[PDB]
Design a protein around this ligand. Structure first.
Ligand code: TOL
Length: 275
């Protein structure tokens, strides 16, 4: 069963595992060769409880949003939490609103639940970008806004330049990548009502031997895989939600089961000490 957590200070709970859609319908460019199969995979995921869907305008060169737009027609729009993002070349006002409009056209929906700046662009003033996002909110095209790949100092700057609340910061965070801890970003989010959304929450390969050995012992004690332990570790943290890459039905089932794991206080301290 899906774990839910409050988003920001919105009073709204969202699935604490998002459905990562990078690669569905292509990566950087559109891939049409598996459209029927991919729509079926998206519907299967949503039916399992993955109603929080993470995508972006540049996923599959726009085709990922198109495939999501077909899959979601089997469901009530208000039951889904759809996240999209704008590429850093589109952060000027007119370009952002065009990116938003085209995202809504490809999704064939009237609004996105959450819209994020994918990556900061120092050349474009944050106040302009955030003011354009607020126009989208005022028009009913966006429910919530957030940022992605903003370190602590830039998140603070964004908060100071945003009319609307910044409800999240989506950053890379996993058992080996501790930049959000070392930056004080996780602590800032926990103390300021911002959800930290961990992408690449699983490190599937190239782990250190100390990490592998520690995860293997805890996984054994819980009858789980090391990937389930990596996810449970993130989900145990206040204000942390995770976006595993969907991939396939086996991953969707395994990751959903990771919400059933209750790590002990000893296990958490041991995992915390790996980075
Ligand atoms: C459009 O191009 C992208 C976009 C995003 C990425 C990402 C990221 S950060 N994501 C897929 C997650 C996201 O965009 O939210 C990781 C690696 C290569 C990428 C690439 C690229 F493959 F080119 F390098």
């Amino acid at each position: 069963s899906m774990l839910y957590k409050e988003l920001g200070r919105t009073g709204e709970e969202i699935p604490a595992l998002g459905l990562g859609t990078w690669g569905i319908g292509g990566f950087e460019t559109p891939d049409y060769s598996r459209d029927e199969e991919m729509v079926e995979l998206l519907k299967t995921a949503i039916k399992m409880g993955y109603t929080h869907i993470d995508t972006a305008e540049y996923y599959g060169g726009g085709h990922t949003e198109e495939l999501i737009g077909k899959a979601i027609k089997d469901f009530r729009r208000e039951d889904l939490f759809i996240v999209s993002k704008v590429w850093p070349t589109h952060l000027r006002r007119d370009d952002l609103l065009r990116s938003l409009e085209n995202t809504l056209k490809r999704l064939d929906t009237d609004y996105v639940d959450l819209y994020l700046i994918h990556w900061p662009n120092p050349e474009i003033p944050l106040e302009e970008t955030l003011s354009a996002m607020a126009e989208g909110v005022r028009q009913g095209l966006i429910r919530y806004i957030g940022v992605s790949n903003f370190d602590r100092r830039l998140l603070e700057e964004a908060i100071s330049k945003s009319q609307e609340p910044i409800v999240c910061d989506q950053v890379k965070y996993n058992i080996e990548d501790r930049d959000p801890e070392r930056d004080g970003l996780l602590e800032f989010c926990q103390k300021n009502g911002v959800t930290l959304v961990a992408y690449s929450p699983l490190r599937r390969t190239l782990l250190s031997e100390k990490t592998k050995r520690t995860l293997e012992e805890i996984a054994k004690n819980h009858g789980a895989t090391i990937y389930q332990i990596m996810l449970a570790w993130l989900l145990a943290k206040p204000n942390v939600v995770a976006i595993p890459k969907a991939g396939r039905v086996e991953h969707l089932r395994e990751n959903l089961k990771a919400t059933e794991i209750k790590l002990s206080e000893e296990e958490m301290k041991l995992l915390d000490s790996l980075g």
